[PDB]
Amino acid sequence: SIIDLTKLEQKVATMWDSILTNSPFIHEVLDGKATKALYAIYMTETYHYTKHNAKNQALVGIMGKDLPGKYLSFCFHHAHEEAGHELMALSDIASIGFDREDVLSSKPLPATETLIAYLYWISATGNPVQRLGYSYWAENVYGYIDPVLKAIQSTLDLTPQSMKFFIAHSKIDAKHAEEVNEMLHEVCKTQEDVDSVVAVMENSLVLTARILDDVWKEYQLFQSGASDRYAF
Amino acid sequence: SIIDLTKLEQKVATMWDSILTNSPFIHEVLDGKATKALYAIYMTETYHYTKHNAKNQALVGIMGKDLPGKYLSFCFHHAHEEAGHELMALSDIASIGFDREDVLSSKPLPATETLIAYLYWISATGNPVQRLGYSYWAENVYGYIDPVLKAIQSTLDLTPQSMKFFIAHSKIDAKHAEEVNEMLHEVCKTQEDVDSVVAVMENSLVLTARILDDVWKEYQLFQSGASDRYA
Amino acid sequence: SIIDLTKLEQKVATMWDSILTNSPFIHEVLDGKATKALYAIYMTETYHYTKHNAKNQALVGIMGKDLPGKYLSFCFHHAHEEAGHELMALSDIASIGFDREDVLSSKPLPATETLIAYLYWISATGNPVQRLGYSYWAENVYGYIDPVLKAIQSTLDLTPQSMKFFIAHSKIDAKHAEEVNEMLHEVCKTQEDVDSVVAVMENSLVLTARILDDVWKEYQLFQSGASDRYA
Amino acid sequence: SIIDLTKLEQKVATMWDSILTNSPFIHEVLDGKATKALYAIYMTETYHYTKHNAKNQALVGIMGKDLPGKYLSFCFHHAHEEAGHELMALSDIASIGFDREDVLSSKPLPATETLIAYLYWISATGNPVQRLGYSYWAENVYGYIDPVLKAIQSTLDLTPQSMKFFIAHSKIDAKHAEEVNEMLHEVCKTQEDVDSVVAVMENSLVLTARILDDVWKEYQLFQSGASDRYAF
């Protein structure tokens, strides 16, 4: 294999370190000061972008030219596996006493809309291998964010029922992680293939981090600033 | 359920009757006059449109707005099930002594390119339910074409190895027909939904029938003055 | 230049000869038997595919990779020139006493939907030069269909007001034919480029001819048992 | 008319104020310390996103459903007017002694790739009116960035020949600005139409500002850090 996954693992570990050290959202949570409203604001944006993942994954298989047989199957298989996953986030929001309808009628925050656009773009154009970079960190993510999830669970005294989105991830994503890694070794033939994977891995994570910044800004404005939300 | 599948079955039966009674290609086969070249020309075009089915099926799931949960799952599941199916046609061509490379480097015939265009268009636009009309006759075809298949097998003395495309996935095909029928009852809520399914069912079959015409024209030119083929 | 437009002109002339000699629609008109209903059914389908021409022309410019500068400009310029042209067909229908709303709420006939699908497909995929084949015959049609137009004008005693679609933009049409020819010499660098232009020219005209067949079938049903229309 | 352009003008003026006050790139220029390399790095990214503008403008006309007649014409007309505009940026780069080929073979910076994705997305989906928001600030832009352009012209002692991209803008964009404003009044029927225009105006400008940040980071790394560039 031409791809060195220890090198990608190293870049991902460096990026999370920065995100967790600099995000006020993450510090607020780890201090033990997360609230229902904060968790909802954040789960709402997760719902918004997650809603498009099956679709943009399937798009690689439609737009990609001369993909290896295994890669075309992979795209449709995983699109099928991801379909509806956003409902788990919407279920978690309902589990903490909020209205599913307020979420369904909401427009995504600008950072989230920006991530959504990026993911369709890199799925519809360029080196068809590149979306695997998103999947690479997206699937081996539980190992870095576990302390943040454990702190939210403690502060809001949540049960696995109000945390289904992150409970699916750490069970059948230890398999999906293995599947992504095997697919990466199969489809990466040149260094240009690897470079495109690294470029998408990096930017998709940079863009996902900006969502935390939008979530935090709207959370602060939430007390007075804007009529954007409903506290019950 | 608002859809009456016996009515759809009746329209399909009427259309096949016409196609089988009027296609010179079909009579040639039934007359016991099929040749390796004829089967290969035909399987090559099947290869060209089948190559796109997984892709246009997945496309309904991407372009359709507010699809029932079961239908979005259905689109991606079925795209996954169809992925690679064209390889079975390629394999049958190889099985009768021809080169897989001459197929891979060939351009589809005009009627085949026309069907491909149509199926992408009805998958990307309009009432998202409509592609199920294509699937309706397509998953339930073997019963009408069985005699044509049996005659090809006899003339060219073929084994199941040279006929994977039409009889490898027979148990799978029976399950897919049931799944399409169940999905049709599920997603058709208004008569406009049903009409869109019927329009696509009809036109996709009309366009598929034009492929037989192109195959026959090029076959007659094949034993003559069109060096478009190799044998 | 690598393209020989006299060769293209010869293939187009051969194809029209066939369409005009075999279409019952064309003979009906030439026999002096056109009616308002017949012209409206036909203009309604013209409206349906013309509605998409600006859009699929613009699409070549968006999907084409590394197009010569002049060709990208050409695609967007011509899309701009074509925008709204379907309104002229709508206007002609209104001019002979029918309701513009019955046209706007109608679904295209299957053959028309098939042409629309094909033109988007060849604009979105393949050799980006190929749509120019459609334009080639389409901008240079009036000379072959002139007698049919003249016969319609006589039977239904039409003025230029009821025939805007075919004779309002005549000076503009002559300039567009020249522009397509110049662009063809400019963008065709290899024989594969030329072949792709010829394939599209041929199939787009074959598919347009199928519209005449659908128009005739529905017209015969119109004075009978298809309440698909209003008169 | 339902849209109040003085309100949009006010939001744009507030955003530029922030961008110009906080961008190290902009301060570096206004101090009189811009260099050929800095101008090239920046013009290269302008080239990258400008290259797609005619295309994403034409896309609104292809994807938009039931657009007013004047709006469909507008989309194709303006796509035609924008076609090739990126060549002016590439011409400016050549005018200061750099190789056009180094630009053509370069991949856009992540912030630029992110803007490109966003613009196609908002052009292919949602309320078809919304891309006019990008055009709104894009066309009435010369009035805020004029001092930055005048400082670059002085430091690098440039003639109108090495500044064709920003010389086209301030002549036939006083017409385009008027055309956008007239089109906005024509196509905005509801407040939801206006809101979509405002949302795109804001995010497209936020995303364009991030390009300045990527340009600056790569410019600093340019002395030692990375082999990404060529100083001649």
Side-chain angles (χ1 to χ4, degrees), chain A residues 1-6 8 11-32 34-35 37-64 66-69 71-106 108-139 141 143-149 151-163 165-170 172 174 176-177 179-181 183-191 193-216 218-232, chain B residues 1-6 8-9 11-32 34-35 37-64 66-69 71-106 108-139 141-149 151-163 165-168 170 172 174 176-177 179-181 183-191 193-216 218-231, chain C residues 1-6 8-9 11-32 34-35 37-64 66-69 71-106 108-139 141-149 151-163 165-168 170 172 174 176-177 179-181 183-191 193-216 218-231, chain D residues 1-6 8 11-32 34-35 37-64 66-69 71-106 108-139 141 143-149 151-163 165-170 172 174 176-177 179-181 183-191 193-216 218-232:
Chain A
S1 177
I2 190 192
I3 196 170
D4 176 32
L5 296 178
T6 61
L8 281 67
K11 220 317 176 193
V12 170
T14 290
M15 291 180 65
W16 279 115
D17 178 33
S18 170
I19 295 169
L20 303 179
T21 298
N22 287 311
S23 180
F25 173 90
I26 301 292
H27 314 163
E28 176 75 355
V29 176
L30 299 184
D31 298 5
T35 70
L38 180 61
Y39 181 60
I41 289 169
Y42 167 83
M43 290 304 307
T44 299
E45 297 313 295
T46 298
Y47 159 87
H48 287 310
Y49 81 80
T50 292
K51 181 170 56 190
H52 295 280
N53 285 353
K55 295 184 177 196
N56 62 48
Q57 177 56 94
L59 195 53
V60 179
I62 297 152
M63 300 300 288
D66 299 299
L67 299 176
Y71 190 41
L72 178 71
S73 284
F74 172 99
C75 291
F76 300 144
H77 169 67
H78 281 274
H80 174 241
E81 289 304 294
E82 294 300 288
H85 187 59
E86 77 284 355
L87 294 177
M88 303 188 78
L90 192 63
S91 179
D92 293 339
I93 292 167
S95 293
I96 60 168
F98 299 116
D99 199 330
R100 301 175 92 262
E101 290 300 336
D102 294 348
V103 177
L104 310 171
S105 65
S106 77
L109 292 175
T112 311
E113 200 69 56
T114 305
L115 175 60
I116 293 162
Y118 179 70
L119 294 180
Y120 277 100
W121 178 248
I122 65 78
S123 298
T125 71
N127 191 331
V129 148
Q130 71 188 350
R131 194 198 179 279
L132 291 172
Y134 172 45
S135 293
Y136 182 75
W137 72 263
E139 298 297 332
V141 74
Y144 305 96
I145 60 166
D146 192 47
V148 181
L149 303 179
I152 212 81
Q153 183 172 354
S154 308
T155 303
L156 296 172
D157 201 339
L158 293 162
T159 69
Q161 301 285 357
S162 300
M163 203 158 285
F165 182 87
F166 287 114
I167 284 287
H169 249 243
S170 195
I172 292 62
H176 286 40
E179 296 179 344
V180 171
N181 292 4
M183 194 54 46
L184 283 163
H185 290 313
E186 162 64 15
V187 302
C188 291
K189 307 298 189 175
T190 62
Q191 181 59 53
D193 294 339
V194 170
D195 290 343
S196 68
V197 167
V198 170
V200 174
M201 182 186 72
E202 286 174 349
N203 200 57
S204 57
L205 184 47
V206 166
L207 292 189
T208 306
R210 300 214 312 144
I211 295 181
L212 293 172
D213 302 333
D214 275 9
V215 172
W216 187 241
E218 294 296 334
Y219 176 67
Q220 300 177 74
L221 275 41
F222 170 68
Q223 39 274 3
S224 322
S227 291
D228 190 340
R229 287 161 186 160
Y230 25 85
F232 282 90
Chain B
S1 171
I2 205 192
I3 192 164
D4 171 29
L5 298 182
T6 60
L8 274 49
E9 178 179 302
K11 218 317 180 191
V12 174
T14 291
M15 292 185 65
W16 281 115
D17 176 41
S18 170
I19 290 182
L20 306 172
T21 305
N22 299 328
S23 181
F25 174 79
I26 295 303
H27 311 163
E28 182 80 349
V29 181
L30 298 180
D31 280 326
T35 59
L38 185 55
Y39 183 56
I41 291 168
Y42 172 76
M43 291 309 303
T44 295
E45 297 310 301
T46 297
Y47 163 81
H48 291 309
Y49 78 82
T50 291
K51 187 170 58 188
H52 293 283
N53 286 329
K55 298 178 176 190
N56 61 54
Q57 176 62 96
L59 192 54
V60 178
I62 290 165
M63 301 297 295
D66 304 315
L67 306 180
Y71 188 41
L72 179 63
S73 305
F74 176 95
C75 296
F76 301 141
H77 172 63
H78 285 265
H80 175 241
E81 293 284 294
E82 279 291 304
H85 186 65
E86 72 278 354
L87 298 188
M88 284 174 165
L90 200 52
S91 180
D92 294 325
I93 295 167
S95 290
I96 65 179
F98 301 119
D99 198 336
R100 287 170 76 105
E101 301 296 332
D102 304 324
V103 180
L104 297 175
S105 70
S106 67
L109 289 179
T112 309
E113 198 74 68
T114 301
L115 178 65
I116 294 167
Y118 181 71
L119 296 175
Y120 274 102
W121 178 253
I122 67 81
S123 300
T125 70
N127 193 328
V129 161
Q130 70 191 355
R131 194 191 182 282
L132 291 163
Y134 172 45
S135 297
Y136 180 76
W137 67 264
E139 298 300 340
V141 81
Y142 183 93
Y144 307 96
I145 66 166
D146 180 65
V148 176
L149 292 171
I152 218 81
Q153 186 196 297
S154 306
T155 304
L156 303 181
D157 195 21
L158 299 180
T159 71
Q161 299 299 327
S162 297
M163 217 158 302
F165 183 90
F166 289 112
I167 65 178
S170 291
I172 303 75
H176 284 17
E179 289 174 340
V180 166
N181 294 0
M183 193 59 55
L184 278 168
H185 292 289
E186 180 72 26
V187 300
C188 291
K189 302 300 187 179
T190 66
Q191 183 58 58
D193 286 336
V194 178
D195 293 343
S196 78
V197 167
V198 163
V200 170
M201 185 191 74
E202 289 180 348
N203 201 58
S204 51
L205 189 46
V206 169
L207 297 182
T208 308
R210 303 200 325 125
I211 297 178
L212 303 187
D213 296 333
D214 276 20
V215 162
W216 183 246
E218 298 295 328
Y219 177 63
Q220 289 188 296
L221 279 38
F222 166 70
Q223 53 254 32
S224 298
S227 291
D228 189 352
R229 317 279 179 170
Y230 17 80
Chain C
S1 171
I2 205 192
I3 192 164
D4 171 29
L5 298 182
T6 60
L8 274 49
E9 178 179 302
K11 218 317 180 191
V12 174
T14 291
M15 292 185 65
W16 281 115
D17 176 41
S18 170
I19 290 182
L20 306 172
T21 305
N22 299 328
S23 181
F25 174 79
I26 295 303
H27 311 163
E28 182 80 349
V29 181
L30 298 180
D31 280 326
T35 59
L38 185 55
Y39 183 56
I41 291 168
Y42 172 76
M43 291 309 303
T44 295
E45 297 310 301
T46 297
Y47 163 81
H48 291 309
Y49 78 82
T50 291
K51 187 170 58 188
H52 293 283
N53 286 329
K55 298 178 176 190
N56 61 54
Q57 176 62 96
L59 192 54
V60 178
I62 290 165
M63 301 297 295
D66 304 315
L67 306 180
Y71 188 41
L72 179 63
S73 305
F74 176 95
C75 296
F76 301 141
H77 172 63
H78 285 265
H80 175 241
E81 293 284 294
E82 279 291 304
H85 186 65
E86 72 278 354
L87 298 188
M88 284 174 165
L90 200 52
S91 180
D92 294 325
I93 295 167
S95 290
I96 65 179
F98 301 119
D99 198 336
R100 287 170 76 105
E101 301 296 332
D102 304 324
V103 180
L104 297 175
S105 70
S106 67
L109 289 179
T112 309
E113 198 74 68
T114 301
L115 178 65
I116 294 167
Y118 181 71
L119 296 175
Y120 274 102
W121 178 253
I122 67 81
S123 300
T125 70
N127 193 328
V129 161
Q130 70 191 355
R131 194 191 182 282
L132 291 163
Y134 172 45
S135 297
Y136 180 76
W137 67 264
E139 298 300 340
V141 81
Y142 183 93
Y144 307 96
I145 66 166
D146 180 65
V148 176
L149 292 171
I152 218 81
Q153 186 196 297
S154 306
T155 304
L156 303 181
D157 195 21
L158 300 180
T159 71
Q161 299 299 327
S162 297
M163 217 158 302
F165 183 90
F166 289 112
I167 65 178
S170 291
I172 303 75
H176 284 17
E179 289 174 340
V180 166
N181 294 0
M183 193 59 55
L184 278 168
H185 292 289
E186 180 72 26
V187 300
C188 291
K189 302 300 187 179
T190 66
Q191 183 58 58
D193 286 336
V194 178
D195 293 343
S196 78
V197 167
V198 163
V200 170
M201 185 191 74
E202 289 180 348
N203 201 58
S204 51
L205 189 46
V206 169
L207 297 182
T208 308
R210 303 200 325 125
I211 297 178
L212 303 187
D213 296 333
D214 276 20
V215 162
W216 183 246
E218 298 295 328
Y219 177 63
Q220 289 188 296
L221 279 38
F222 166 70
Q223 53 254 32
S224 298
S227 291
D228 189 352
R229 317 279 179 170
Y230 17 80
Chain D
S1 177
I2 190 192
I3 196 170
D4 176 32
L5 296 178
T6 61
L8 281 67
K11 220 317 176 193
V12 170
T14 290
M15 291 180 65
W16 279 115
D17 178 33
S18 170
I19 295 169
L20 303 179
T21 298
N22 287 311
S23 180
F25 173 90
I26 301 292
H27 314 163
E28 176 75 355
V29 176
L30 299 184
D31 298 5
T35 70
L38 180 61
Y39 181 60
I41 289 169
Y42 167 83
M43 290 304 307
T44 299
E45 297 313 295
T46 298
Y47 159 87
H48 287 310
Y49 81 80
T50 292
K51 181 170 56 190
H52 295 280
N53 285 353
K55 295 184 177 196
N56 62 48
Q57 177 56 94
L59 195 53
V60 179
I62 297 152
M63 300 300 288
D66 299 299
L67 299 176
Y71 190 41
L72 178 71
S73 284
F74 172 99
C75 291
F76 300 144
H77 169 67
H78 281 274
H80 174 241
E81 289 304 294
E82 294 300 288
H85 187 59
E86 77 284 355
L87 294 177
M88 303 188 78
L90 192 63
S91 179
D92 293 339
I93 292 167
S95 293
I96 60 168
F98 299 116
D99 199 330
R100 301 175 92 262
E101 290 300 336
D102 294 348
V103 177
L104 310 171
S105 65
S106 77
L109 292 175
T112 311
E113 200 69 56
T114 305
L115 175 60
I116 293 162
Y118 179 70
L119 294 180
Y120 277 100
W121 178 248
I122 65 78
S123 298
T125 71
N127 191 331
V129 148
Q130 71 188 350
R131 194 198 179 279
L132 291 172
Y134 172 45
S135 293
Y136 182 75
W137 72 263
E139 298 297 332
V141 74
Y144 305 96
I145 60 166
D146 192 47
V148 181
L149 303 179
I152 212 81
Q153 183 172 354
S154 308
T155 303
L156 296 172
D157 201 339
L158 293 162
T159 69
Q161 301 285 357
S162 300
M163 203 158 285
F165 182 87
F166 287 114
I167 284 287
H169 249 243
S170 195
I172 292 62
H176 286 40
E179 296 179 344
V180 171
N181 292 4
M183 194 54 46
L184 283 163
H185 290 313
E186 162 64 15
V187 302
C188 291
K189 307 298 189 175
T190 62
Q191 181 59 53
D193 294 339
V194 170
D195 290 343
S196 68
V197 167
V198 170
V200 174
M201 182 186 72
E202 286 174 349
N203 200 57
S204 57
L205 184 47
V206 166
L207 292 189
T208 306
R210 300 214 312 144
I211 295 181
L212 293 172
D213 302 333
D214 275 9
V215 172
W216 187 241
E218 294 296 334
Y219 176 67
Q220 300 177 74
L221 275 41
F222 170 68
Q223 39 274 3
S224 322
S227 291
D228 190 340
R229 287 161 186 160
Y230 25 85
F232 282 90

